[PDB]
Amino acid sequence: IVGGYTCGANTVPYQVSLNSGYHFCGGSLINSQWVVSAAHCYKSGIQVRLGEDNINVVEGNEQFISASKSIVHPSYNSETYNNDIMLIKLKSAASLNSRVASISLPTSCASAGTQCLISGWGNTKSSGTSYPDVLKCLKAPILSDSSCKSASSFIITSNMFCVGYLEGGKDACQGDSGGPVVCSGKLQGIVSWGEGCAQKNKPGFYTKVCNYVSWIKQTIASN
Ligand SMILES: [Ca+2]
């Protein structure tokens, strides 16, 4: 995350890391057996990692559970990132506690201006590579739908909101993808894409979970 701060060991207990020999995408724990993340993060043989803060050191509190199944949205579009959502079932239920807890799904969509908390172990620089050891946080507001679009070269659909800072400097970035956007204690979004990171007039775009609650609840029940 570019222009953020250190969250602090387990201050974001719903945040998960998806690992395939090394961290590559983020995720959010929505119940003891299911994580939600981005469609575009799909990989086979994913190891979900709960309770992490320093991803490169074993601190105790870590839980490493394998993905028994990974269900991508059937309408995912890999070229426009529309319906960038994926549900991962854990092979065994996670041991829920103070440092590894689930986040509620939303009951209604969040309106422009609401302040949200974005997080992950992604890149922290506008130019170049600097992957942090510890979990990073950014507080940012939802921008108005008109704002994202004036400021855009790529297709934006109704399943995406956008959040951040048009001035630039503060944004999610590569490696945060699939991570959480929490607003008022509810997971409203999934880190999906942006035109680079932290660039002037190019905010971040996020899957709009509020559109997907039926599909999540239903997929979970029948799997
Ligand atoms: Ca660790």
Swiss-Prot record:
Please provide the Gene Ontology terms (biological process) for this protein. digestion; proteolysis
GO CC, alphabetical:
extracellular space; serine protease inhibitor complex
- Listed name of the protein: Serine protease 1
Q: In the UniProt entry, which residues are flagged as the active site?
A: 40 (charge relay system), 84 (charge relay system), 177 (charge relay system)
The taxonomic lineage of its organism, from the top, reads: Eukaryota, Metazoa, Chordata, Craniata, Vertebrata
The yes or no answer to whether the keyword Disulfide bond is present is yes
Broad enzyme group? hydrolase
Q: How is it modified after translation?
A: Subsequent cleavage after Lys-125 leads to alpha-trypsin. Further cleavage after Lys-170 yields pseudotrypsin. A cleavage may also occur after Arg-99.
Q: What is its main location?
A: secreted
What is the activity regulation entry?
Is inhibited by scorpion cyclotide trypsin inhibitor TopI1.
Q: Which UniProt keywords apply?
A: Calcium, Digestion, Disulfide bond, Hydrolase, Metal-binding, Protease, Secreted, Serine protease, Signal, Zymogen
User: Does the keyword section mention Hydrolase?
Assistant: yes
InterPro entries associated with the record: Peptidase_S1_PA, Peptidase_S1_PA_chymotrypsin, Peptidase_S1A, Serine_Proteases_S1, Trypsin_dom, TRYPSIN_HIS, TRYPSIN_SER
Cofactor needs: Ca(2+)
User: Where would you find this protein in the cell?
Assistant: Secreted, Extracellular space
Pfam families the UniProt entry points to: Trypsin
Q: Which cysteines are joined by disulfide bonds?
A: 7-137, 25-41, 109-210, 116-183, 148-162, 173-197
